[PDB]
Design a protein around this ligand. Structure first.
Ligand SMILES: *[C@@H]1O[C@H](CO)[C@@H](O[C@@H]2O[C@H](CO)[C@@H](O)[C@H](O)[C@H]2NC(C)=O)[C@H](O)[C@H]1NC(C)=O
Lengths: 53, 53
């Protein structure tokens, strides 16, 4: 209109959510509980010698 | 203990960025790391260099 140009109003997103990126250390000692559980049950068997004889 | 100390690093990483955001907000600026700013480049058509200003 005349010399000036008119532009439409811009709609705005109401909310934003922040989810930052985190470094991944990738440690291996955690989630190894099964090995500890296996260590718990060694179960060495010893039979008395001389009771039979 | 290692399981705890692995998760503590993420807490520290979040703490640094949150402190930076607080400084920017107290400073009457905008932290563009926490905001998208990609939707308004399409609503109003501007170049990549013009969006930096
Ligand atoms: C939290 O644990 C999950 C599951 O172990 C991790 O997600 C894995 O990440 C690796 C590395 O990018 C991918 O190869 C796997 O496919 C992912 N698995 C799943 C189920 O998503 C995640 O990385 C861990 N978070 C941190 C910060 O270490």
């Amino acid at each position: 209109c005349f010399g000036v140009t008119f532009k439409k109003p811009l709609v705005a997103e109401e909310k934003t959510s922040l989810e930052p990126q985190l470094p991944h250390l990738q440690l291996r000692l955690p989630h190894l509980v099964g090995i500890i559980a296996k260590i718990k049950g060694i179960k060495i068997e010893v039979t008395s010698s001389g009771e039979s004889i | 203990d290692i399981s705890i100390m692995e998760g503590m690093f993420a807490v520290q990483h979040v703490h640094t960025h949150l402190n930076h955001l607080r400084t920017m907000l107290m400073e009457r600026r905008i932290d563009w790391t926490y905001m998208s700013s990609s939707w308004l480049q399409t609503q109003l058509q501007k170049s990549d260099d013009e969006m930096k200003v």
